[PDB]
Amino acid sequence: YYWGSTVTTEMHNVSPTQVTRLPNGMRVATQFSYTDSATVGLWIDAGARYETKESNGTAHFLERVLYLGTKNRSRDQLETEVENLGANLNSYTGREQTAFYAKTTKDGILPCIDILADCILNPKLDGDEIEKERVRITQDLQAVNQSYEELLYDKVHTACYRDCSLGQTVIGPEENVATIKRDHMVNYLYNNFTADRMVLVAVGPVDHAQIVKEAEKKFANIRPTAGPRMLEEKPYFCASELVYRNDDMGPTAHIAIAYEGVPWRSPDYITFMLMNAIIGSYDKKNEGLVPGLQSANRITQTGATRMDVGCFDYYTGFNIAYKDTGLFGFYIATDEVAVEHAVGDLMFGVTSFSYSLTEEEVMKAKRELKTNFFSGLDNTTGVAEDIGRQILAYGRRLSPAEFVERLDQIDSQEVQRVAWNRLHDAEITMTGVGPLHGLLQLWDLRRQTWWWRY
Amino acid sequence: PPIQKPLLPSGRAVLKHGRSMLCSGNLSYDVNSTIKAPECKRGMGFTQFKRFTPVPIESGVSVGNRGWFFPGVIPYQGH
Amino acid sequence: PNTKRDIRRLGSYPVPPESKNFWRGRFQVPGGQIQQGVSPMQQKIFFQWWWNLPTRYFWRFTKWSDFLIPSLMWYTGFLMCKNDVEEGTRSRYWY
Amino acid sequence: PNTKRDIRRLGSYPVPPESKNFWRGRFQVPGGQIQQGVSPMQQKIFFQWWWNLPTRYFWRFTKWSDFLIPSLMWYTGFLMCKNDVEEGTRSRYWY
Amino acid sequence: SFHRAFARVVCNYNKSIEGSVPWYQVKREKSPFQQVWDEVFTPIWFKLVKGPYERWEYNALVARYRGMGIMADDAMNDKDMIVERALDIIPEDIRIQRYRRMMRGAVLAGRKLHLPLELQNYDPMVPYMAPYIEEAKFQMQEEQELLAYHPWDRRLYTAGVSGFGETSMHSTFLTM
Amino acid sequence: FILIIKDNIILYNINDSINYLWNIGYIIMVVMIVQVITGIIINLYMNINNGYKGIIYIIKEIYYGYILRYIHNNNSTLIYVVVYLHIIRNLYYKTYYYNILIWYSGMIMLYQLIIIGFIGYILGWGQLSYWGITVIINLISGIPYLILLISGNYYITIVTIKRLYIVHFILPIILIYVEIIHVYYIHYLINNNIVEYNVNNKIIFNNYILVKDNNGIIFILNIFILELNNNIFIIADNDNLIEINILVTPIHIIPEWYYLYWYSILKLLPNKYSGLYIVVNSISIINILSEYKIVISEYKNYKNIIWYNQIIQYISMIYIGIQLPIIEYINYGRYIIIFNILLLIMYLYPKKKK
Numbered sequence A: 001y002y003w004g005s006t007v008t009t010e011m012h013n014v015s016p017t018q019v020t021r022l023p024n025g026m027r028v029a030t031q032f033s034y035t036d037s038a039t040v041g042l043w044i045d046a047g048a049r050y051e052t053k054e055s056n057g058t059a060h061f062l063e064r065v066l067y068l069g070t071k072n073r074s075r076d077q078l079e080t081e082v083e084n085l086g087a088n089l090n091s092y093t094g095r096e097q098t099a100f101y102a103k104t105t106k107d108g109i110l111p112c113i114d115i116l117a118d119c120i121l122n123p124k125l126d127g128d129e130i131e132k133e134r135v136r137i138t139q140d141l142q143a144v145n146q147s148y149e150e151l152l153y154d155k156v157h158t159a160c161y162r163d164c165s166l167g168q169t170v171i172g173p174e175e176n177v178a179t180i181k182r183d184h185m186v187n188y189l190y191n192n193f194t195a196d197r198m199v200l201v202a203v204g205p206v207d208h209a210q211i212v213k214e215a216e217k218k219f220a221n222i223r224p225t226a227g228p229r230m231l232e233e234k235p236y237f238c239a240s241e242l243v244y245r246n247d248d249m250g251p252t253a254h255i256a257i258a259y260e261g262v263p264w265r266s267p268d269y270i271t272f273m274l275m276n277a278i279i280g281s282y283d284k285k286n287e288g289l290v291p292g293l294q295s296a297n298r299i300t301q302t303g304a305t306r307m308d309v310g311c312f313d314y315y316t317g318f319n320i321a322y323k324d325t326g327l328f329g330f331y332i333a334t335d336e337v338a339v340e341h342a343v344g345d346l347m348f349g350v351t352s353f354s355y356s357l358t359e360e361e362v363m364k365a366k367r368e369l370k371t372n373f374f375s376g377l378d379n380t381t382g383v384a385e386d387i388g389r390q391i392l393a394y395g396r397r398l399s400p401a402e403f404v405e406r407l408d409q410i411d412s413q414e415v416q417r418v419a420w421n422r423l424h425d426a427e428i429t430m431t432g433v434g435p436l437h438g439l440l441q442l443w444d445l446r447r448q449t450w451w452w453r454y
Numbered sequence B: 001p002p003i004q005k006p007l008l009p010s011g012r013a014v015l016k017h018g019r020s021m022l023c024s025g026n027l028s029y030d031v032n033s034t035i036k037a038p039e040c041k042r043g044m045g046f047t048q049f050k051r052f053t054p055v056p057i058e059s060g061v062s063v064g065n066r067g068w069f070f071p072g073v074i075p076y077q078g079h
Numbered sequence C, D: 001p002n003t004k005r006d007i008r009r010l011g012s013y014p015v016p017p018e019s020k021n022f023w024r025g026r027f028q029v030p031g032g033q034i035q036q037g038v039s040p041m042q043q044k045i046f047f048q049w050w051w052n053l054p055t056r057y058f059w060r061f062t063k064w065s066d067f068l069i070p071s072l073m074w075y076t077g078f079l080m081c082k083n084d085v086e087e088g089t090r091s092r093y094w095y
Numbered sequence E: 001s002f003h004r005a006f007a008r009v010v011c012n013y014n015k016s017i018e019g020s021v022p023w024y025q026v027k028r029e030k031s032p033f034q035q036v037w038d039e040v041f042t043p044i045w046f047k048l049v050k051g052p053y054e055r056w057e058y059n060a061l062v063a064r065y066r067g068m069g070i071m072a073d074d075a076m077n078d079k080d081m082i083v084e085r086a087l088d089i090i091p092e093d094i095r096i097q098r099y100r101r102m103m104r105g106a107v108l109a110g111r112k113l114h115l116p117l118e119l120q121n122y123d124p125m126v127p128y129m130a131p132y133i134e135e136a137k138f139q140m141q142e143e144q145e146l147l148a149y150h151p152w153d154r155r156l157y158t159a160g161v162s163g164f165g166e167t168s169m170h171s172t173f174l175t176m
Numbered sequence F: 001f002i003l004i005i006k007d008n009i010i011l012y013n014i015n016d017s018i019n020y021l022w023n024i025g026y027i028i029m030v031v032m033i034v035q036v037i038t039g040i041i042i043n044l045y046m047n048i049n050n051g052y053k054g055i056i057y058i059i060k061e062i063y064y065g066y067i068l069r070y071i072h073n074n075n076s077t078l079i080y081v082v083v084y085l086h087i088i089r090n091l092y093y094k095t096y097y098y099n100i101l102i103w104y105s106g107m108i109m110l111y112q113l114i115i116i117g118f119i120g121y122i123l124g125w126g127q128l129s130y131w132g133i134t135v136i137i138n139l140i141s142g143i144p145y146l147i148l149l150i151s152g153n154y155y156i157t158i159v160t161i162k163r164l165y166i167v168h169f170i171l172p173i174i175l176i177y178v179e180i181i182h183v184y185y186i187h188y189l190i191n192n193n194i195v196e197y198n199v200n201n202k203i204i205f206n207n208y209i210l211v212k213d214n215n216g217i218i219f220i221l222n223i224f225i226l227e228l229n230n231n232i233f234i235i236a237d238n239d240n241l242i243e244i245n246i247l248v249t250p251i252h253i254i255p256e257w258y259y260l261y262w263y264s265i266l267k268l269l270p271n272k273y274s275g276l277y278i279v280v281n282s283i284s285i286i287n288i289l290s291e292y293k294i295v296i297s298e299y300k301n302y303k304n305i306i307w308y309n310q311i312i313q314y315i316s317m318i319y320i321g322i323q324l325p326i327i328e329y330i331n332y333g334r335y336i337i338i339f340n341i342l343l344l345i346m347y348l349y350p351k352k353k354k
């Protein structure tokens, strides 16, 4: 039901994001902010998904060696120069997107553009640096050196996307890590780090014209384009199970259950964001001002009552989106004996969206969704991530006002329609690590996606 | 648009006891910082599943006692 | 229930009343396992019956052949008794 | 069972399965009590029935006297109906 | 859809009665008809039936309490949930004397005896529980309004509870 | 009881490696309920004062009464088939070695069933039934005066029918109670697998085992419906449709097929009590077949040669029972009894060491 518009005057009072396309095809996006610090970086449309099976892991390796010296600097000189500017260089690598962003002061904006351009365009992939990083990457590759939340994040993709490259991990298999060489990385740079796939984001005390001029000068020699990516069909969602039963790792079990989600540009994506908010998160060790027994979240409240002890030591919803697919589900960390109750309750919660979801819960979720999104845009790095991630995902940045406008239209009935179409009687994928005697078969859990009542 | 924070807000003070905005180091990457951007040792994306609550999990710790039992007393058939 | 080592539980969460029998059949998995599977909605549900058909019936008939010699001795006795009954009736009566 | 404060147990020893109902009727005694008694083998077992006999029957008859007025109205109605039936039968019939 | 229309009717009818003064907070002048009724019937009815009958019952109740040696508020049964929630928060001094009186009353009632007259000169209708009854009702009304405004859906017959609302395990026949 | 049901049906874990021979028990429980229901409904139209004329009135005058009459007779045959096959299974996989308590509970139901079926036959009030009970009752003719107390007269009359009928009405309800004691031990003492050891391969019952158990029961229903409406197999002797005449003896006084093993034992042994006693041995010795063993093994998944010869001994004795008392069949049948004693000694005896 429609209860009015929550857009306010303050939402319109934000500096505009100016996006211009350079002649080579590189987009330059900037937003001015009244700050003494800035964030300037390069958000690229590269990642593990766009690697082949034999080369999986090259992108992650390159990201770890790109700041270890250039053809015009050395590692010590580069690190010294950044420190003198009072700046720090960051970088991450994902399945579909990558970034290389610097957090500096106002006077270091243009100087940092020069540093980042040199690293991206003229990386000196010294053999010694590669070999040392090979050891570090290999140690990280060991699952003993990986958290259980990182392990289940990767295994969810492995189980759900057996047929496509989205199932590949970022770090890569140990066989590939053992064999990556400079030539692999040089090829990856040539094919993927091209102007058409890069966005230069500058947030802070910045002027669009000046940033654009510097960008054109420093990125003049970048490869203009690479061949269009091979057209593929929708990533097939495999309803499978990948459970690592281990009764020798303590009492806590980690279970992740996934449904097929929606791509970034889907009209239903904001509905899935709201549904993710309704699921929410809960930790027995950080319950908040409201206790679990008296929580407005229905999943949390019913869970907190089970056996007078609570069946969720921790849980969170997740909504992962890619260009042509997505994953929607929940992650649980709970006592071994509580797993059956925990998965049963969260699946009952997701199934409830399709039958009996109250306006009260939706409206609370809208406010906490907006309180999480807006607070993320507080600092320059948060804004820069939002600009770079949103231009890659959508080709434009959605304004806070537009997000609120579209969220106003979504109500309990809209959530019910989307859930009924996509989540009710739907195929699921379960992945887990730990003592999981209580975890039932996939078919048993999949029947809990529909109700005999109502 | 992307969500950059966990669904469970921390609700705690960011700066540590006795540490100020001048002497807390750089909160973006300092080890003791409560808002340090996590490490991409195995790639980006796992923060959507990560539990950001610092206190380690105590499996089975009770949170559903409405005041009906004392600590250390085992309920029998819920009574 | 299973052995007391098998049914010994790592977690401190109480056993639900409806899952008493379930947790009395718990096993302490040694060394770990990696269990995998696919939903029946995305699989061929009758092929395996055909794929395993020849071997199933071969290994069944080879085991059931153990009883052949016992079966033959019993049938020989059945025939001997039948004929003995007939000759005895024809001898007592039947001029 | 009793209130949740009453049935809340101080001890950590598990409730025996045969004493479930017994411990669901527990009371949290406030301020304490000093209960005393003597075995029936060392007491007069019939005297108290005699000692309490007069007061028991006095306080019973004084309470049951509350129903006297109700009882009399109902008996008056019973007599009126009986006589009405008889006169009506003698009027319809009985020349 | 006819349900969507009914939802608008309900929404609009409730929006039009928000902030209404309860019937008992309106200064009300009785109808002339009621006034005539309250000047003919009420007086005579009180003098001949209500008055005498209700004094007869009230005096008996006071005597019964005095015989047991208990107060009127002692007689409340804790199976009532408002009474239980109030008894949680009574001070220990009140609690101790309340238990001793109730214990003596049950002993006397079971043994068919009555409190000695020397101890019967007290007012049994002192409302010592009133402060805590009111607090308990306030706490319960908050929980009712803020936590029980909808017939919630829960997984049925799990964790020892029916899922239809009760919070204690093994508290129904079907939950054994 | 809903939580109990969920613990014993919905969250009950069973090994995934079991065959269709582990579905026989489900069928017994279902066919047993059907026999109670049909019996109670038939009772609504039956007069135990003359059950010969009463069965005629059910099949000719009651609407769909023929269904009730033939289901109740044929479903008895079915009950005994499934029970006897359930025992053969338990012997093959030696499911009495570690689950004796389950075996004991089952044997109690077997004893009760043996009494229920016999007395139900006599309620038919036909020649065979009358003379059959007149022969059995005269086995306890040694215990002084007890025949008179059971019969209620010096010869079987409606007096005897009126009392046995109450045992036939009530004893089945007690059997259903023992079925609970049986399912109680099965759920506590976990079921045996096709493999001798215990493995972590268990799956919930409602979503998997009940679907398979229903495929089994529906398979049997197809076959039972064909017998119920077309009498593909002769499972009821025709001489029970002859009006009782105490003066004329039937052509052959035999029981139903599911009592022919013990009928033969009693017609083969030369002393009446010896025969009664060898019937006791058959239904008692099988309850101690693992008690004297001393090795850490359950003697399971061997060639089961001794088992095969025992199952055939049962079938062969049933054949001899059908046959008239020709002397030749008696001699051959006495050898089959000697052989059974020897096979049963083989099971009982512990082994020495070389």
Ligand SMILES: CCCCCCCCCCCCCCCCCC(=O)OC[C@H](COP(=O)([O-])OCC(O)COP(=O)([O-])OC[C@@H](COC(=O)CCCCCCCCCCCCCCCCC)OC(=O)CCCCCCCCCCCCCCCCC)OC(=O)CCCCCCCCCCCCCCCCC
Pocket (backbone or CB within 6 Å): C049, C056, F020, F021, F023, F024, F085, F212, F215, F216, F217, F219, F220
């Ligand atoms: C002109 C008119 C022309 C008309 C033409 C009409 C033609 C009609 C053709 C119809 C063909 C149907 C074919 C169906 C194939 C698909 C099967 C399937 O999906 O099964 C899976 C499905 C179960 O799925 P699953 O559990 O995943 O897999 C089952 C097994 O694990 C998988 O292993 P499996 O392969 O062994 O499974 C086969 C079957 C096998 O099941 C059985 O065979 C059950 C009975 C076992 C005893 C077998 C005795 C064998 C005696 C052989 C005698 C041979 C004489 C040879 C003479 C030669 C002369 C030259 O299993 C079952 O059906 C399981 C039933 C469970 C029953 C539960 C109770 C068990 C109690 C314990 C065991 C029995 C103890 C007592 C007996 C002891 C005997 C010593 O099985 C069924 O439910 C199928 C039922 C139907 C079976 C086949 C029926 C064939 C009928 C042919 C009729 C031809 C008529 C021609 C008329 C011509 C007129 C001119």
Ligand code: HEM
Pocket (backbone or CB within 6 Å): F032, F035, F036, F037, F038, F039, F040, F041, F042, F043, F046, F055, F069, F072, F073, F076, F079, F113, F116, F117, F118, F120, F121, F123, F124, F168, F169, F170, F172, F173, F175, F236
């Ligand atoms: C273990 C369950 C039972 C079995 C094995 C059993 C067996 C049988 C048998 C073999 C018959 C003879 C059928 C015929 O005449 O050929 C019979 C008759 C009868 N039984 Fe049952 N019975 C069972 C339970 C019941 C129950 C619970 C009742 C109901 C009180 C009942 C009522 C009847 C009646 C009235 C008859 C006589 C009608 C008839 O001949 O069909 N039976 N029973």
Ligand code: HEM
Pocket (backbone or CB within 6 Å): F021, F022, F023, F024, F025, F026, F028, F029, F083, F086, F087, F090, F095, F096, F099, F102, F103, F104, F105, F106, F107, F108, F109, F110, F113, F179, F182, F183, F186, F190, F191, F192, F193
């Ligand atoms: C009224 C007849 C009986 C019924 C209702 C019945 C029912 C059942 C049921 C439902 C099962 C569990 C499912 C199975 O594994 O098939 C079972 C198991 C068993 N029964 Fe029976 N039974 C009966 C007769 C008997 C008899 C007479 C015996 C003993 C000779 C017996 C011994 C056993 C044993 C040993 C098991 C365990 C088998 C294994 O280990 O899994 N039963 N029965």
Ligand SMILES: COC1=C(OC)C(=O)C(CC=C(C)C)=C(C)C1=O
Pocket (backbone or CB within 6 Å): F081, F084, F085, F087, F088, F258, F259, F261, F262, F282, F314, F315, F318
């Ligand atoms: C001892 O109990 C008996 C059996 O179980 C072991 C049988 O198998 C048999 C044989 C059954 C068939 C169907 C031939 C009978 C009759 C029997 O008496």
Ligand SMILES: COC1=C(OC)C(=O)C(CC=C(C)C)=C(C)C1=O
Pocket (backbone or CB within 6 Å): F114, F118, F132, F133, F136, F253, F254, F255, F256, F259, F261, F262, F263, F264, F266, F279
């Ligand atoms: C009519 O003849 C019958 C027999 O003949 C001796 C039996 O053995 C039996 C079986 C007897 C026992 C004790 C198992 C019955 C029931 C029977 O009806």
